Design a protein around this ligand. Structure first.
Ligand SMILES: CCCCCCCCCCCCCCCCCC(=O)OC[C@H](CO[C@@H]1O[C@H](CO[C@H]2O[C@H](CO)[C@H](O)[C@H](O)[C@H]2O)[C@H](O)[C@H](O)[C@H]1O)OC(=O)CCCCCCCCCCCCCCCCC
Ligand code: CLA
Ligand code: CLA
Ligand code: CLA
Ligand code: CLA
Ligand code: CLA
Ligand SMILES: CCCCCCCCCCCCCCCC(=O)OC[C@H](CO[C@@H]1O[C@H](CS(=O)(=O)O)[C@@H](O)[C@H](O)[C@H]1O)OC(=O)CCCCCCCCCCCCCCC
Ligand SMILES: CC1=C(/C=C/C(C)=C/C=C/C(C)=C/C=C/C=C(C)/C=C/C=C(C)/C=C/C2=C(C)CCCC2(C)C)C(C)(C)CCC1
Ligand SMILES: CC1=C(/C=C/C(C)=C/C=C/C(C)=C/C=C/C=C(C)/C=C/C=C(C)/C=C/C2=C(C)CCCC2(C)C)C(C)(C)CCC1
Ligand SMILES: CC1=C(/C=C/C(C)=C/C=C/C(C)=C/C=C/C=C(C)/C=C/C=C(C)/C=C/C2=C(C)CCCC2(C)C)C(C)(C)CCC1
Ligand SMILES: CCCCCCCCCCCCO[C@@H]1O[C@H](CO)[C@@H](O[C@H]2O[C@H](CO)[C@@H](O)[C@H](O)[C@H]2O)[C@H](O)[C@H]1O
Ligand SMILES: CCCCCCCS[C@@H]1O[C@H](CO)[C@@H](O)[C@H](O)[C@H]1O
Ligand code: OEX
Ligand SMILES: [Ca+2]
Ligand SMILES: [Ca+2]
Ligand SMILES: [Cl-]
Ligand SMILES: [Cl-]
Ligand SMILES: [Cl-]
Ligand SMILES: [Mg+2]
Lengths: 334, 81, 137, 37, 30, 30, 62, 97, 38, 451, 34, 38, 29
């Protein structure tokens, strides 16, 4: 075999401790770049003029942040959606003032994670598995795209992308609620059902399988030793678990089919989170949550508040306070 | 099975529908009239569109005393003439 | 509280003559205001110039007075700046400029009266909300 | 609006655009009729 | 000292990633 | 109150109806 | 002329409804496929015809 | 010693009347006939050593002078405050509804 | 009477349509009367 | 009943249509019937829009998405996009509906009456998914059909009334395109533009000449390629690169459609040449800019020197510089300085917004347009309450641009998901493990341990 | 062979009866005008 | 900057070419079962 | 506003009607 042949053979080898693969060929350098830039920035980057009004925000540890407040700050509103690589800046100092680290990190990362999904397909293929784990992963990935790429595109600026930081994430959420009423959006609601429900069923499933573990151990040892890796026998009694749950609710509310059950366990959170992602991605184009502000009116015409109107007051607080020096004209139109 | 008759059996039986083609619409009509007669308003104390404020008033009748709250709501109701 | 004939009684002219609108007139007025006006004037403010609102006191202090039906109808025909000095049909919807503001084309005298009546009645209902903007939401 | 002549069919026109959806629903009626075999 | 502390904890976590992956107890079939 | 009888006339007529129609099976069961 | 247009359009809608229920039931029917096929041909030509007639008379009532 | 100059000015005639030398133009909407024509002329020809000097604006019609005379009681003048007049704030002071 | 007489697919179709009708009514009510903002 | 339960077909009812994979006659049925659904919706939706259409209200105030498409083509509208005759809308709708009846007819025929497989019937219309020659032949057919379509757009533009041009000198108007851009440098130049800000890839196309010339090119490329694929069969490297099966092809087309949906989303969101703002409403950028314009005009009327007015941040309150120096509108709309529109360009000079032009040359129609676009920004609620999320009920408005953008982002996304699904499944099935792992031949058990 | 009035019957009806009544009420409410 | 740019352009091109040619190199056949997919 | 409901009744039944007719005459469902 020639050199390129050998190379392809190693790349696609099923014997590598960590699988490389052709998706991995793109994944590894882009993720390494995003990682390195992120750590260095998070520690040592200077303040960034996120809203393009010469009002630099400090994101790094060395410039007065802790883990909770710290962030890699989004690129300048003055940049908008312009491509701002290092070689477009007159200097590193400029690049840093204008939030270049952010664009480097989110682009390399989005590429890398996309390739992570691909790579999941690829290894499933090499091992003779069925292919759809990558489809489950498409849901969190789509969410990442939503908050890092799509919403900035829709709003015309990476300055409105989610910050790479904890408190900054909260900033993103609060402002989002103010400008889109995301809570009143059925897709966010489906997303909440997705993650609340995913948590519920995670606990439920874990607890039911744990409940019907077949006795294989003594009281003075972990029940986990009752299972050995690679054993051909299932380690719990699914008929016992189903007898239990089926009696908890009623019989036909319960799964006796493990395949069906596990499909459900995959489908519910994946679908929910798909809708959450689509919620962010469509609110990206300013199609927003239900607006029932002043929806209930009495006989004279007096407004009768509902809880929706209280939500509206809160949203107003957020709206008028956010980015307090950035608006000159009365409507926040992006 | 647990003894009871299968639901498929029941809800595809002629007798079931003979019964429920009466009982279901009767209930429905009963709830309908519970609203349309206005009874609901008075059972639960819910304001009609013309009973939130007196004609010129614009202040919510908020309950503000725990133990004489009943007298307060009654007063707020009298205040609508 | 109800939408009484008294609520629906508004100044017809500067001379202290009133007119009482029908409930159909009130409804027609809200509809026509939404149709031709709310895009800038939702809630009684003015989105493209917030300094000027549609509160009755503001219209009263306008020149010529716009806090009555005749004033409002006239405004919808030949709009002026607040001091009356300039005619602004070229940048403000009116019958006079129904050619460049096409939604004004199918508005009848009856319609203008209804819109006017809406502008006058609504603050009697909503109070400070009318012309209040987000503070009073 | 529609040409005057066709005005009589206004309600029909209001209902037509949703007819494609009905087909999806029909696919299920059909499946229920053959027991989802 | 704060910054040092944060970066130190993070660094420890990364080291831990390394050991948990390459120096894991190998799974064995029975 | 007359509205109570007007409203709860359908309910009790339905109850009486189904009682009439299910009486023999109910007696057979009991 | 308006009466002709209105007749042609009412006929068009009715025949359309009839065809919509009829053609699939016919295709999926075991018995009497011969006369049914005849009728589908007939109804088709008459459908096309009616469409062309409404089309023409349109410009003489609008 | 440190002082907010805007708060300080609120305790002068500025907090009481339309200051011909400082107040934002939208204030002229308070009174019949002043906005927008006269308001623009007034802000444009500021500052004024006294209120009645507003009558000396070149080009005024007699009607215009009459309206001004009718409203001098609502006017005042104080020292020009840089904080209130820089940034075109007399034409737009970042306040809407 | 005997169970199975009325086909389950018809019960399902009829029930489904009834649901669509009542929910459709509720969405209609969002635009009319109370709660319509008008 | 061939292949119409799980036991025989292998597929459950919810994967029911997978039973049609090698039943080309019935599959033809499904496809033609579906095309009938699409053409149906076009017709019906159009007649619906028309019935609800008030010609003196802007289209975008009326929830229209199809009539704007018909109007962009030149039909029914005159200068400024004013509706001058609705009859072409009527025609387009009626004809689409009538045609949907035909397609439905053929679809239902092939689906439940005609030959279930087409290979015994005709060697021309029959096909084997594995037959690369036939596949590329059908592909070729349809390429030629597409090229023909693009050429139909070209013909409408050049020989049958032209297209609506928002950029037409003296104002928007329908115009005949006589000198379409044919230079490949320009046409494919578009294809090599960055998709990022101030560039916008093909979405940046901003004159009808480029649109028409691009469609000429695309027509010729498609017909040529179609002939090419009729006449050839896939080469060696192609053969070794792809999975050759029905599901694989489906997956490929799903990927392509996803891509196209994303592209359409960006097009309707940013472009105002083939989506004229007269019909579709202002773009987001456009409306933000329009607000800036509006208050510059108001304040300058009041006597403000907008060129020297310093805002609170130190940046100009009305005017500032782009990172490369051009004079642009200030405030948040600084992000939108790449916006170009017929109402704003008269104020633009070589260095950007021109202060002299701003002081002296702003026409009342420009003020009007700016106020209109400012007050019809593509912001609104799911129940169609126009404006920011805190606005009170009064205006019934959600921009057609929002509707189109969001709908097609959702559809594109789910189509990407579909491509992953069917690509992965296609691979697994072609390799033979789509139904699970062979217990007696579990591949990982024959691999060395990782550690 | 089958009983009619079981525990299941009771449960089913304690839910089903009020539901239909409530739905009738809410239906009626759709025509209330201020 | 220009050197940095050229460097990055060369790197990216290199890896992209690796990706493409890599996937062109008989990938359907790189699986544990049916390697004949041509 | 009545004819909308009448028409959608005719169309809405048109669908299930076909299935029913075919099921009765034991057609090729
Ligand atoms: C095989 C494919 C392999 C791909 C490998 C990766 C290569 C890079 C891919 C690009 C990824 C997104 C880049 C940023 C896209 C963007 O900013 O898109 C915007 C651009 C358009 O840009 C805008 O275009 C505008 C053009 O309008 C101009 O011209 C107009 C003419 O009328 C007007 O006058 C207007 O006012 C004027 O401004 C301007 O230039 C703006 O400044 C500019 O920002 O869209 C476009 O170019 C085209 C649309 C691109 C797709 C949109 C994103 C899709 C990604 C979804 C992923 C989901 C994944 C889920 C995984 C699970
Ligand atoms: C775009 C929508 C669409 C289309 C075009 C199709 C098409 C098809 N399906 Mg699929 N399917 C769909 C959605 C669709 N399906 C959905 C949503 C599901 C989930 C419920 C399924 C689940 C499914 C299963 C489980 C099966 C199919 C099968 C089929 C094929 C044969 C059906 C048959 O012969 O039954 C016969 C049905 C009848 C005879 C009743 C009448 C049906 C006709 C078409 C109604 C016509 C109505 C129309 C208004 C008439 C207009 C006439 C006018 C022009 C004059 C056919 C090609 C079958 C197959 O693959 O066979 C090999 C099959 O087994 N489908
Ligand atoms: C490209 C698709 C598209 C777009 C952009 C529009 C846009 C519009 N339509 Mg149209 N329409 C469409 C398709 C579309 N429609 C279809 C398919 C039909 C037949 C049902 C219609 C029939 C129709 C009528 C009768 C009317 C409109 C109207 C409108 C306007 C108001 C929209 C509104 O309030 O929605 C409300 C929003 C919703 C109901 C939300 C829909 C959310 C969907 C169901 C989620 C789907 C997610 C995904 C597909 C599911 C995947 C499952 C997952 C597990 C994988 C707006 C301009 C109105 C108008 O103003 O006319 C002038 C109007 O009266 N449309
Ligand atoms: C669109 C895809 C399509 C394809 C590939 C087929 C293919 C076939 N059809 Mg089907 N069919 C279709 C759609 C299609 N049909 C439509 C739309 C209808 C309703 C009219 C039918 C109704 C139908 C019936 C009743 C029968 C067939 C039959 C056949 C078979 C013989 C056809 C033949 O040899 O004619 C030879 C071809 C010609 C004489 C030339 C046709 C000239 C065309 C119509 C001019 C228009 C061309 C232009 C591109 C159309 C644009 C339409 C577009 C804008 C939507 C063949 C397998 C026969 C069969 O299956 O036998 C068992 C048969 O009896 N078809
Ligand atoms: C294929 C390239 C292409 C592109 C970029 C466009 C673009 C456009 N078209 Mg045109 N058109 C095309 C082909 C194309 N068209 C074809 C084939 C037809 C016949 C169906 C038409 C018929 C047509 C009409 C009648 C009209 C338009 C209109 C438009 C404009 C608005 C619609 C839109 O947003 O489309 C966006 C385009 C896309 C989303 C397609 C992107 C294609 C990508 C770039 C390539 C995909 C290749 C594929 C995935 C891989 C090939 C595999 C191979 C490499 C192995 C826009 C400039 C409207 C207009 O111009 O108004 C004045 C209009 O009225 N088009
Ligand atoms: C629906 C449209 C369509 C489809 C599905 C196909 C499909 C095919 N073509 Mg055909 N072709 C078409 C239209 C189409 N063609 C047209 C219109 C022309 C005239 C231009 C041609 C001219 C043509 C030739 C000369 C050849 C083919 C060949 C092929 C076969 C292999 C192609 C391949 O591997 O693509 C995958 C694409 C590549 C391998 C190219 C390099 C890959 C890079 C990464 C592409 C990057 C593009 C980028 C993502 C796009 C972003 C925008 C960009 C412009 C910047 C495949 C059957 C080959 C064949 O086998 O013929 C029998 C072949 O030699 N085609
Ligand atoms: C708000 C006021 C609250 C205060 C409390 C008032 C109510 C007290 C709590 C009652 C809770 C349960 C009531 C229903 C019990 C029941 O359905 O038994 C059904 C039984 C036996 O059914 C028979 O029972 C068996 C079926 S099973 O038991 O239902 O599973 C079966 O063996 C047989 O075929 C069948 O006929 O018949 C009765 O006699 C019911 C008596 C009336 C109650
Ligand atoms: C296959 C299949 C399927 C599907 C099917 C389909 C999808 C079909 C389609 C079909 C179609 C797609 C149809 C269509 C039809 C149409 C029609 C029938 C029309 C008619 C029209 C008319 C009649 C018109 C009229 C008028 C005029 C002319 C003027 C104006 C007014 C009016 C509108 C009145 C399903 C899923 C079920 C399942 C089974 C299989
Ligand atoms: C019309 C128009 C125009 C134009 C257009 C054009 C001219 C276009 C073209 C276009 C094109 C020209 C496109 C292309 C595309 C391509 C693609 C999209 C590709 C893909 C590929 C693939 C997918 C591959 C894959 C792979 C790999 C990578 C590796 C190996 C294996 C495989 C094969 C799988 C303009 C803008 C001027 C203007 C407007 C109008
Ligand atoms: C255009 C036109 C026309 C046409 C028409 C048509 C084409 C129709 C079709 C129609 C149809 C196509 C219908 C359908 C319907 C369907 C339905 C109505 C369904 C429903 C369903 C449901 C309700 C379901 C249920 C269920 C089941 C079954 C199972 C599971 C469970 C559930 C519940 C989901 C005519 C002739 C009138 C004439 C005029 C014009
Ligand atoms: C940036 C875009 C680039 C676009 C490039 C388009 C190229 C179009 C022609 C592609 C030619 C493919 O050429 C491809 O490479 C080498 C050539 O020795 C071959 O080499 C491969 O052979 C076998 C195939 O089983 C592999 O196991 C082996 O690892 C590898 O050496 C591939 O089998 C061949 O198909
Ligand atoms: C495929 C259906 C074609 C229907 C016929 C289209 C006629 S197109 C017709 O042509 C004229 C110039 O020749 C234009 O002035 C006119 O506006 C245009 O509608
Ligand atoms: O940047 Mn970030 O935040 Ca989206 O709105 Mn506008 O801009 Mn700003 O204000 Mn609100
Ligand atoms: Ca060929
Ligand atoms: Ca009343
Ligand atoms: Cl903020
Ligand atoms: Cl701003
Ligand atoms: Cl005020
Ligand atoms: Mg209501």
């Amino acid at each position: 075999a020639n050199l390129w042949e050998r190379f392809c053979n190693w790349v696609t080898s099923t014997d590598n401790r960590l699988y490389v693969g052709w998706f991995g060929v793109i994944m590894i350098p882009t993720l390494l770049a995003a990682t390195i830039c992120f750590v260095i920035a998070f520690i040592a980057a200077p303040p960034v003029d996120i809203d393009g009004i010469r009002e630099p925000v400090s994101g790094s540890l060395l410039y007065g942040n802790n883990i909770i407040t710290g962030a890699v700050v989004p690129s300048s509103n003055a940049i908008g959606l312009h491509f701002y690589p290092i070689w477009e800046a007159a200097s590193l100092d400029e690049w840093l003032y204008n939030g270049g680290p952010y664009q480097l990190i989110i682009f390399h990362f989005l590429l890398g994670a996309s390739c992570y999904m691909g790579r999941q397909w690829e290894l499933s293929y090499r091992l003779g598995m069925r292919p759809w784990i990558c489809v489950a992963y498409s849901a969190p990935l789509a969410s990442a795209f939503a908050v890092f790429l799509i919403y900035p595109i829709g709003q015309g600026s990476f300055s409105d992308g989610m910050p790479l930081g904890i408190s900054g994430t909260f900033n993103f959420m609060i402002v989002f609620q103010a400008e889109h009423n995301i809570l009143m959006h059925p897709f966010h609601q489906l997303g909440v059902a997705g993650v609340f429900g995913g948590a519920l069923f995670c606990a439920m499933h874990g607890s039911l399988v744990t409940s019907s573990l077949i006795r294989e151990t003594t009281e003075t040892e972990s029940a986990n030793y009752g299972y050995k890796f690679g054993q051909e026998e299932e380690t719990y009694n699914i008929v016992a678990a189903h007898g239990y749950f089926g009696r908890l609710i009623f019989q036909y509310a319960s799964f006796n089919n493990s395949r069906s059950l596990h499909f459900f366990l995959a489908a519910w959170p994946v679908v929910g989170v798909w809708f959450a992602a689509l919620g962010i991605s469509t609110m990206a184009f300013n199609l927003n949550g239900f607006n029932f502000n002043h929806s209930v009116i009495d006989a004279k015409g007096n407004v009768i508040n509902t809880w929706a109107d209280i939500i509206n007051r809160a949203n107003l607080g957020m709206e008028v306070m956010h980015e307090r020096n950035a608006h000159n004209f009365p409507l926040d139109l992006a | 099975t647990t003894g009871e008759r299968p639901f498929s059996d029941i809800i595809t039986s002629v007798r079931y529908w003979v019964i429920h083609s009466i009982t279901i619409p009767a209930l429905f009509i009963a709830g309908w009239l519970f609203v349309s007669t206005g009874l609901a308003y008075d059972v639960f104390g819910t304001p009609r569109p013309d009973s939130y404020y007196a004609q010129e008033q614009r202040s919510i009748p908020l309950v503000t005393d725990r133990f004489e709250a009943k007298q307060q709501v009654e007063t707020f109701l009298e205040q609508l003439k | 509280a109800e939408l009484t004939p008294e609520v629906l009684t508004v100044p017809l002219n500067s001379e202290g003559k009133t007119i009482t609108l029908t409930e159909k007139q009130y409804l027609e007025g809200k509809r026509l205001f939404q149709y031709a006006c709310a895009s800038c004037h939702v809630g009684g403010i003015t989105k493209t110039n917030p300094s000027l609102d549609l509160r009755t006191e503001t219209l009263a202090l306008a020149t010529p007075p716009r806090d009555n039906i005749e004033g409002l109808v006239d405004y919808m025909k030949n709009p002026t700046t607040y001091d009356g000095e300039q005619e602004i049909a070229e940048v403000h919807p009116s019958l006079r400029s129904a050619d460049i503001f096409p939604k004004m084309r199918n508005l009848t005298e009856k319609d203008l009266v209804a819109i006017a009546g809406h502008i006058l009645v609504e603050p009697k209902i909503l109070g400070d909300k009318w012309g209040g903007g987000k503070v009073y939401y | 609006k529609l040409p005057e002549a066709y005005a009589i069919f206004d309600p029909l026109v209001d209902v037509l655009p949703v007819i494609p959806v009905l087909f999806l629903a029909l696919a299920f009626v059909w499946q229920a009729a053959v027991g989802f075999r | 000292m704060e910054t040092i502390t944060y970066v130190f904890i993070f660094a420890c976590i990364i080291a831990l990633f390394f050991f948990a992956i390459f120096f894991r107890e190998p799974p064995r079939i029975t | 109150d007359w509205r109570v009888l007007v409203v709860l006339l359908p309910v009790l007529l339905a109850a009486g109806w189904a009682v009439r129609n299910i009486l023999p099976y109910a007696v057979k069961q009991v | 002329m308006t009466i002709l247009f209105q007749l042609a359009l009412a006929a068009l809608v009715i025949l359309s409804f009839v065809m919509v229920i009829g053609v699939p039931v016919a295709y999926a029917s075991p018995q009497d496929w011969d006369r049914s096929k005849q009728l589908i041909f007939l109804g088709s030509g008459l459908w096309i015809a009616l469409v062309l007639v409404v089309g023409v008379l349109n410009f003489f009532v609008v | 010693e440190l002082v907010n100059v805007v708060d300080e000015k609120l305790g002068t005639a500025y907090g009481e009347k339309i200051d011909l030398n400082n107040t934002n133009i939208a204030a002229f909407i308070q009174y019949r006939g002043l906005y927008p024509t006269l308001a623009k002329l007034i802000v444009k020809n500021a500052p004024y050593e006294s209120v009645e000097d507003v009558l000396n604006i070149p080009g005024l019609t007699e009607r215009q002078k009459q309206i001004l005379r009718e409203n001098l009681e609502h006017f005042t003048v104080t020292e020009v405050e840089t904080a209130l007049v820089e940034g075109g704030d007399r034409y737009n002071n970042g306040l809407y509804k | 009477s005997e169970g199975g007489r009325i086909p389950l697919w018809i019960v399902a179709t009829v029930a489904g349509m009834g649901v669509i009708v009542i929910v459709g009514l509720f969405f209609y009510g969002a635009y009319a009367g109370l709660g319509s903002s008008l | 009943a061939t292949n119409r339960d799980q036991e025989s077909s292998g597929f459950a009812w919810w994967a029911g249509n997978a039973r049609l994979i090698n039943l080309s006659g019935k599959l033809l049925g499904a496809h033609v019937a579906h095309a009938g659904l699409i053409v149906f919706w076009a017709g019906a939706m159009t007649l619906f829009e028309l019935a609800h259409f008030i010609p003196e209200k802007p289209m975008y105030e009326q929830g229209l998405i199809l009539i704007p498409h018909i109007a962009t083509l030149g039909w029914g509208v005159g200068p400024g996009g004013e509706v001058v005759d609705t009859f072409p809308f009527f025609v387009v709708g009626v004809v689409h509906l009538i045609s949907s009846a035909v397609l439905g007819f053929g679809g239902v025929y092939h689906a439940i009456r005609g030959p279930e497989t087409l290979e015994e019937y005709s060697s021309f219309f029959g096909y084997d998914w594995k037959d690369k020659n036939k596949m590329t032949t059908i592909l070729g057919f349809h390429l030629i059909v597409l090229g023909i379509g693009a050429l139909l757009l070209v013909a409408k533009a050049m020989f049958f009334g032209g297209l609506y041009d928002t950029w037409a000198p003296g104002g928007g108007d329908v115009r005949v395109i006589t000198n379409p851009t044919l230079d490949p440098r320009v046409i494919f130049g578009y294809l090599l533009k960055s998709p990022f800000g101030g560039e916008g890839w093909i979405v940046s196309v901003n004159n009808l000449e480029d649109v028409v010339g691009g469609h000429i090119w695309i027509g010729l490329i498609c017909i040529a390629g179609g002939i090419w694929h009729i006449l050839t069969t896939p080469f060696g490297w192609a053969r070794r690169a792809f999975i050759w099966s029905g599901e694989a092809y489906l997956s490929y087309s799903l990927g392509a459609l996803s891509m196209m949906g994303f592209i359409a989303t960006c097009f309707v969101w940013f472009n105002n040449t083939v989506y004229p703002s007269e019909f579709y409403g202002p773009t987001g950028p456009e409306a933000s800019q329009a607000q800036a314009m509006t208050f510059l005009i108001r304040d300058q009327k009041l006597g403000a020197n907008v060129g020297s007015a310093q805002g609170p941040t130190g940046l100009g309150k009305y005017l500032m510089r782009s990172p490369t120096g051009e004079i642009i509108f200030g405030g948040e709309t600084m992000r939108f300085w790449d916006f170009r529109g017929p109402w704003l360009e008269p104020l633009r000079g070589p260095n950007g917004l021109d202060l002299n032009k701003i002081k002296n040359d702003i026409q009342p129609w420009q003020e009007r347009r700016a106020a209109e676009y400012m007050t019809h920004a593509p912001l609104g609620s799911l129940n169609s309450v126009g404006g920011v999320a805190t606005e009170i009920n009064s205006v019934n408005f959600v921009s057609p641009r929002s509707w189109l953008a969001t709908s097609h982002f959702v559809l594109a996304f789910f189509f990407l998901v579909g491509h992953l699904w069917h690509a992965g499944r296609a691979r697994a099935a072609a390799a033979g493990f789509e139904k699970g792992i062979d217990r007696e031949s579990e591949p990982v058990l024959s691999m060395p341990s990782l550690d | 062979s089958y009983p009619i009035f079981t525990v299941r019957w009771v449960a089913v009806h304690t839910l089903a009866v009020p539901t239909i009544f409530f739905l009738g009420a809410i239906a009626a409410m759709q025509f209330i005008q201020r | 900057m220009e050197t940095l740019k050229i460097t990055v352009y060369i790197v990216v091109t290199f890896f992209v070419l690796l990706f493409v040619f890599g996937f062109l190199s008989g990938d359907p056949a790189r699986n544990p079962k049916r390697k004949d997919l041509e | 506003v009545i004819a909308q409901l009448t028409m959608i009744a005719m169309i809405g039944i048109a669908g299930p009607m076909i299935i029913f007719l075919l099921a009765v005459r034991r057609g090729n469902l």
